[PDB]
């Protein structure tokens, strides 16, 4: 079992530093370079730099540079990556990886990844606003409706409709982090327009991390 195990999820203020660990087992630690690579919801995979554990030598990407420091402890077989002066920009998933010689055969394996989110925000339940089906049309066609699940942190939120009974036509979007540092998303559903004055439609919002439940009947 050659593997790499990273430290857990980080929420940091704008300006702060993060320290991410990356623990090695199953191989001769000093024989392989460690690379760090990030996945920012925006820009595929970006290499941040390499570190040679033999002697701690590093090669950092100019794109970052100044801001990343990479160090290791040979006795615990653990590598470290500090990213400084964080910005919203740096919200991403961060990966360590083993360069097998150190690009030639590599990169394998990888760490599970470490989510870093850069926010002013602290834990907060969502507001839930109805996305009301339009009065303009149709007669015997299809109406869209929904819930805007706004201004919560951290992930995740779950949305179901009519306590689980309504699953057909539901599209619950991925959360995007807003300018303000709070997540936001909508759940929508299409129903028959002949349904709208008889069947009621309710979205069930749960945000476990704030211990918040909101139910919102959506009219008219």
């Amino acid at each position: 079992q050659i593997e790499l195990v990273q430290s857990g999820t980080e929420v940091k203020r704008p300006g702060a530093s993060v320290r991410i660990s990356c623990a090695s087992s199953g191989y001769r630690f000093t024989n392989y370079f460690i690379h760090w690579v990030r996945q920012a919801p925006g820009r595929g995979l970006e290499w941040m730099g390499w570190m040679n554990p033999l002697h701690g030598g590093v090669n950092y990407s100019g794109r970052f540079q100044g801001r990343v420091t990479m160090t290791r402890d040979i006795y615990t077989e653990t590598s470290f990556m500090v990213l400084s002066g964080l910005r919203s920009d740096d919200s991403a998933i961060y990966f360590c990886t083993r360069g097998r010689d150190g690009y030639d055969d590599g990169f394998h394996p990888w760490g599970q990844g470490t989510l870093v989110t850069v926010t002013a925000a602290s834990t907060k339940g969502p507001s839930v606003f109805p996305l009301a089906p339009s009065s303009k049309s149709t007669s015997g066609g299809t109406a869209a409706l929904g819930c805007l699940v706004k201004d919560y942190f951290p992930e995740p939120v779950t949305v179901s409709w009519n306590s689980g009974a309504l699953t057909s036509g539901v599209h619950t979007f991925p959360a995007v982090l807003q300018s303000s540092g709070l997540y936001s998303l909508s759940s929508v559903v299409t129903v028959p327009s002949s349904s709208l004055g008889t069947q009621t439609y309710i979205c069930n919002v749960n945000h476990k991390p704030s211990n918040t439940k909101v139910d919102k009947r959506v009219e008219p």
Binding site: N59, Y60, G62, F64
Partner: peptide, 20 residues
């Protein structure tokens, strides 16, 4: 050693190394 992350750029940067 020569810094990585520089092919979309005008410069190459060289830092003294070794230890191998």
């Amino acid at each position: 050693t020569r810094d990585g992350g520089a092919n979309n750029t005008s410069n190459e940067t060289f830092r003294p190394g070794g230890g191998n």
